[PDB]
Paper text:
PARS1 is one of the aminoacyl‐[name] synthetases (ARSs), which mediate the covalent ligation of amino acids to their cognate tRNAs for protein synthesis (Kim et al, 2011; Kwon et al, 2019). Unlike the other ARSs, PARS1 exists as a part of the bifunctional enzyme, glutamyl‐prolyl‐[name] synthetase 1 ([name]), which comprises glutamyl‐[name] synthetase 1 (EARS1), three repeats of WHEP domain, and PARS1 (Kwon et al, 2019). PARS1 is a homodimer formed by the PARS1 protomers A and B (Zhou et al, 2013).
The piperidine ring moiety of DWN compounds occupies a proline‐binding site and a ketone group (DWN11251, DWN11748, and DWN11761) or alkane group (DWN12088) connects the piperidine ring with the bicyclic ring, similar to HF (Son et al, 2013). DWN12088 and DWN11251 bound to PARS1 protomers asymmetrically (compounds with asymmetric binding, ABC), whereas HF, DWN11748, and DWN11761 bound symmetrically (compounds with symmetric binding, SBC). More specifically, protomers A and B of SBC‐bound PARS1 and protomer A of ABC‐bound PARS1 showed similar structures to each other, whereas protomer B of ABC‐bound PARS1 was different from the others in terms of the binding of both ATP and the compounds. The most striking difference between the structures was the loss of the electron density map of ATP in protomer B of the DWN12088‐bound structure. However, in protomer B complexed with DWN12088, there was no hydrogen bond due to the absence of an ATP molecule. In contrast, protomer A made over 10 more hydrogen bonds than protomer B in the complexes with ABC, implying the flexible or weakened binding of ATP in PARS1 protomer B. While the ketone group of the SBC formed stable hydrogen bonds with ATP, contributing to their tight binding to PARS1, DWN12088 did not have a ketone group in the bridge, which could decrease the rigidity of bicyclic ring orientation. In fact, the electron density of the bicyclic ring moiety of DWN12088 in protomer B of the complex structure was not well defined, and the R‐loop interacting with the bicyclic ring moiety was almost disordered, implying a potential loose binding of DWN12088 in PARS1 protomer B. On the other hand, when the first DWN12088 molecule binds to PARS1 protomer A, the second DWN12088 molecule could not bind tightly to protomer B due to allosteric effects. This negative cooperativity would make it difficult to inhibit the prolylation activity of PARS1 protomer B, broadening dose–response curve.
Residue numbers in the entry:
A (entry chain A): 1016 to 1311, 1315 to 1463, 1474 to 1497, 1500 to 1512
B (entry chain B): 1015 to 1311, 1316 to 1462, 1474 to 1512
């Protein structure tokens, strides 16, 4: 494949997603086809996350994709700048609808009137619901596959609680799971943090987040969000119960909402991706081991080359390794090597006739590319061991890049000095909005925006330190971002 | 506590139980309904099974855009003039009218087939077998019900493209037997397989296959699943061509199938097994198979009443039985008795205070009202035995309730008599379209062609004449009232 990754990041990414068979383009701009190689990743992420939130009592469901005209701005759910991102159905066939229907850009306007009818007492809480679904956002700044699409797949959770304490607990549990996804499955290191006033979801009380860093572009990307909504929506959609113990006080529910999208797949491509194609974290690669015969003129033993391949396959499916034998004879073995490497398969297993009656095979890992040979009997054992060092390696190496590329700055000239080195940086920060619109202006003369306030900043903020001016309220992570 | 009796008022009875079993909730937009977890659970079980089966025949899951361009939807003869009012069109983004109307997927052929054309550049690239679970909008043609006919629904869409007709035609009937499996092995609804007539099959295809279940209470059958052989109709329009390996420089157009199954299943299972005190759920699809409920309401030993339920719970989770202890205090056992019966849980497990010191408990079945009593120490043995026999009941009772209402008519003489007591009937039928618009007008709200059954109730013989009487009969056709 043509591109490097230092070079022109976009075109490299354009080619890796297309030539690894993950994405296909579509007539309608900003929409993309998820071919099975990519969709499988989403399924693995969804299978992990789904097991997780059922242990916390969340149940899956499905809500309509359509929201009323009346219902959508019946309440101050979103801010005025969100109106342009809403797609409207105007016509059915060619008979104009009496009233425009909107395609859900998020489900809050669709679920919360249901919560209000379901909740008529203390018994009815908590409500913890999840749905995996598609949402369209006519996203104004320009799209690229995965990172920012115009239709995309996500799960969105909405839970309603009677007491504050339970809500604030579920906000961080969900956030730790998101971090689990990025770090246990995708091998991406993340920073947990809270949004500022400029960047928090206006209709809530506070917004939690994880932030990943793409060194090649030098930008951070927010990989997931968990809101504590308090009762802003409770009192607006009138989700009230009366407790007979506390006679005669309207009790509003405490609500959270949380979401995680296919931008996850884009982040894993960008950070682990090389100039030989994709690189797949083993615990997410739909195929972890591809079996190939090579040898790297005779007749009857070529079906015995292929009968041993399907034995290799079956024996490790009994060890629950996901495996595909590539028994196509149409292609040179060398061609399949490039082919499955551009798709980033972690382990290639070569079995040749002169190595077969050696009672063995060679394995090549996609991480480093070195070759080893391990007992035919010792296959279950050793191949699964190799898949795990592949994962810890890709976590470690991407960890080393985030570790190197995140540093502390205390003044503005050297926050600017190190930010134009393509690194993200934590600064003492006021926290107020106008101080922040300014930082991003004075860093163009794109600009650096608030990524988050890390729960665990890199250094303690000392008493009386100021940001630019008012004194500094916390160390916040700043940087250029998607 | 439920209002309607099915016998009395079918529409209201159906509206009453789907809400009060907490399966669906209504919504501002007509024909749209929220699937609460109790319904979505049924759907997920179906999908965990169907996905397992069609993966063994090599289909792969994927996701295609929901928006279809004007050009592509009206590109070729995919649909007909009838089929373009049911399509929802997005025209504006915010207050900015879009240059070109975007249409919301009523099916995905027009999204996928441009993609097959680029993926297929030789016969090595075939077959292509893709499935997607997704939502579909059809702003359709009469007043709606939850499940049975909605305006957005969930389904799976299978699309396969082949080099030879033999392989394609093979997959159309493989798929259909899976649909029959879900309806029959999972849902305990017996079905009849069939082919559509020329009016009723998918116009853009060559022949389209179907399963039909029968709901007695209204007297109507329902189309429960769909498998089309498309021939080279679409390959020729969307130009899915490959080079022939033997004939230098000649295109072969691909052979295509498409098959689909919708959440309309859950509705028909509501209609079929639902009784007059609410739903009945076949156990291998019931998200919870056992409800444990304490009964009898001193504290120090009622704490041993609630701890004994939780050993059953743990004991039955070790047999991979899905079980719920409902140990809530804010509700009386009678209220739970009701609550879970309207949700159709197969086995209710009541424990009353001296049955703990008897080393007993009582088990109640959801179909019959049966009660047994079994020793504490039996965990594996008896509860699974009843969980599996409950399923055999729901199947047969609906099976012979199909053998009830599906009878032979060879003449009209009794066919209209044989149609309108809540009957479905096979007739000798011409095969041509207007004898059928006639049969349905001579019945009235008409008797429609449901399908042409594979494997009918009696063999036909030469020179038999249709109900039309003019032209002779090419096959026995399944007729009846139908949604
Ligand atoms: N257009 C999009 N394509 C893909 N993922 C998206 C898109 N918009 C948002 N996301 C993801 O959805 C998650 C929850 O959505 P959210 O409502 O927080 O979006 P947002 O804050 O408007 O996004 P952003 O700040 O990136 O513009 C985020 O963690 C983000 O990663
Ligand atoms: O962060 C997610 C997690 C999942 C639940 N919902 C919040 C909503 C974010 C709030 N939010 C973001 N973009 C929005 C648009 Cl475009 C509209 Cl119209 C309305 C609201 C919008
Ligand atoms: O059985 C499914 C499986 C997936 C492929 N398509 C067929 C039926 C399409 C045939 N088909 C049925 N209803 C349709 C409407 Cl409303 C429109 Cl607009 C267009 C086509 C329609
Ligand atoms: Mg946005
Ligand atoms: Mg944001
Ligand atoms: Zn400041
Ligand atoms: Zn006729």
């Amino acid at each position: 494949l043509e591109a490097k990754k230092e070079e022109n990041l976009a075109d490299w990414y354009s080619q890796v997603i297309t030539k690894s068979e993950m994405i296909e383009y579509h007539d309608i701009s900003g929409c993309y086809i998820l071919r099975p190689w990519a969709y499988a990743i989403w399924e693995a992420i969804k299978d992990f996350f789904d097991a997780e939130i059922k242990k916390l009592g969340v149940e899956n469901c499905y809500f309509p994709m359509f929201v009323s005209q009346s219902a959508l701005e019946k309440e101050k759910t979103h801010v005025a700048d969100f109106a342009p991102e809403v797609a409207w159905v105007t016509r059915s066939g060619k008979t104009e609808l009496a009233e425009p229907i909107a395609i859900r850009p998020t489900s809050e306007t669709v679920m919360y009137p249901a919560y209000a009818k379901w909740v008529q007492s203390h018994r009815d809480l908590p409500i913890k619901l999840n749905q995996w679904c598609n949402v369209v956002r006519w996203e104004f700044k320009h799209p690229q596959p995965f990172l920012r699409t115009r239709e995309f797949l996500w799960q969105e959770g909405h839970s309603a609680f009677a007491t504050m304490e339970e809500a604030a607990e579920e906000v961080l549990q969900i956030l730790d799971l998101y971090a689990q996804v990025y770090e246990e499955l995708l091998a991406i290191p993340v920073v947990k943090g809270r949004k500022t006033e400029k960047e928090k979801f206006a209709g809530g009380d506070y917004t939690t987040t994880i932030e990943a860093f793409i060194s090649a572009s030098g930008r951070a990307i927010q990989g997931g969000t968990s809101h504590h909504l308090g009762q802003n929506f409770s009192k607006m959609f009138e989700i009230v119960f009366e407790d007979p113990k506390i006679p005669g006080e309207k009790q509003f529910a405490y609500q959270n909402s949380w979401g995680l999208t296919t931008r996850t797949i884009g982040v894993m491509t960008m950070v682990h991706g090389d100039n030989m194609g994709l690189v797949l974290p083993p615990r997410v690669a739909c195929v972890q081991v591809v079996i190939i015969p090579c040898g790297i003129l005779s007749e009857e033993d070529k079906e015995a080359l292929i009968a041993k391949c399907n034995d290799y396959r079956r024996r490790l499916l009994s060890v629950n390794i996901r495996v595909r034998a590539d028994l196509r004879d149409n292609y040179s073995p060398g061609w399949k090597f490039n082919h499955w490497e551009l798709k980033g398969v972690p382990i290639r297993l070569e079995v040749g006739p002169r190595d077969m009656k050696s009672c063995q095979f060679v394995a090549v890992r996609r991480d480093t590319g070195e070759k080893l040979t391990v007992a035919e009997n010792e296959a279950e054992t050793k191949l699964q061991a190799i898949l795990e060092d592949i994962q810890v390696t890709l976590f470690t190496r991407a960890s080393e890049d985030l570790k190197t590329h995140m540093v502390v700055a205390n003044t503005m000239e050297d926050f600017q000095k190190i930010l134009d080195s393509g690194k993200i940086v934590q600064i003492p920060f006021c926290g107020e909005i106008d101080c922040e619109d300014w930082i991003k202006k004075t860093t163009a003369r794109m600009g650096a925006k608030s990524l988050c306030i890390p729960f665990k900043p890199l250094c303690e903020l000392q008493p009386g330190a100021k940001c630019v001016c008012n004194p500094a309220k916390y160390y916040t992570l700043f940087g250029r971002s998607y």
